[PDB]
Structure formats: C-alpha cells, structure tokens
Design a protein around this nucleic acid. Structure first.
Ligand code: ZN
Length: 118
RNA sequence: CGGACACGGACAGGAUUGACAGAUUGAUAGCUCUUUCUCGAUUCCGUGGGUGGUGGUGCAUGGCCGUUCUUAGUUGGUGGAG
C-alpha cells in the first residue's frame, strides 16, 4: 500500500503533465516520460486499450487507480477551497511523469517496477 | 483585442491559440470556407465591471496665453469728514 498512497504524490507537485480535453492523451506521444498513472473508469473499453498500446509494449508502466474524480485533487487544478465547491474539476484518465527532478521519495516507484512486475 | 478583475456554467470520454493548400480578398489577412494539424489551462461564453477616446462641453473647470493694458495707475493701517 506504500506505492499507491504516498511515494507518487510527492512526484505530482510541479512536474510535466497531461491535463484536459485536448491533451488527456497528448503526452503519450513523448519519448521522455517515466512511470505514469492510469484510471480504471473509462467510458469505452478501447480508449484504455488505446493508451496501453503505447506504454506496456514499451519501457513505460501504468499504475491503476479507480477513476478521474478521485484523481481530481491531484492533477493541480485545485477545486476545493475554504470558500469553495467540492467538484469544480474532473481529472484526467492518465497523467504522466516526464522528470522527477529530485529523489525524495522515488525509491519505491522504481521498486514497484522490478520487484514482481520485472 | 491591446474589454484588467469578480460571479457561474462549459474544461479532462475532446475548453482555447496558430497555419500550408486552394474558388477566399484590396491583399502572403487562415477574414471566411472546404480539408486538416499544432498550441497547452493561458482561456472562451454568460453577468456585473474598469478601459481607451485628436468623442462632446473652454458657458462645468485647472494650467497657460491674449487683451482695455505699455498707457500711469492700485491699496490697507491709523486718525479727520459723513
Ligand atoms: Zn457626436
């Protein structure tokens, strides 16, 4: 439970992402992105087959989560506030990590890759 | 758009920029249109809003200048006249 809860959220503050309706699946076209994350609630079953057709054949792995509404408070557009509303953004299916830039808590995402998923 | 900012919706399962071809036009303005890529949450729309103005009004004014006015005039205080 260490991989999905805490070691990746620190790699989501100010990195390079794929954010919105004209770029949810734009950053998959980049040969510059490391370990990404993917949501298991797509409306059509081939759009996730569309995006794993990039990564899983290649050197890139996805992490499953539930959906792109629990992912909304992670992507960067803050919707919840002291004087705010609960749901003013609906997040992406798949945001990628192109560069960590530092090594605070990144030893477990790379341990997530080649411990059992090899 | 060079209409800041504030309000909600449209913004991640397809908001907003740009652009070659061509019948497009005054025009190598992608203006529009057919076709179709790119840009990355910056925005666009709705509503209140500043804003800019060689737009009005010099009879609402400030500054300035012009003039009788380049001729020798103007004024209190303090007493006196009323
Ligand atoms: Zn008029």
């Amino acid at each position: 439970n260490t991989a999905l809860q805490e070691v990746l959220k620190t790699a989501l503050i100010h990195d390079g992402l794929a954010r919105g309706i004209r770029e949810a699946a734009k950053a998959l076209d980049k040969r510059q992105a490391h370990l990404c994350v993917q949501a298991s609630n797509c409306d059509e079953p081939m759009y996730v087959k569309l995006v794993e057709a990039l990564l899983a054949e290649h050197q890139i792995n996805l992490i499953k989560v539930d959906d792109n509404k629990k992912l909304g408070e992670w992507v960067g557009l803050c919707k919840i506030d002291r004087e705010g509303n609960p749901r003013k953004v609906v997040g992406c299916s798949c945001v990628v990590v192109k560069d960590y830039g530092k090594e605070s808590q990144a030893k477990d995402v790379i341990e997530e890759y080649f411990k059992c998923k090899k």
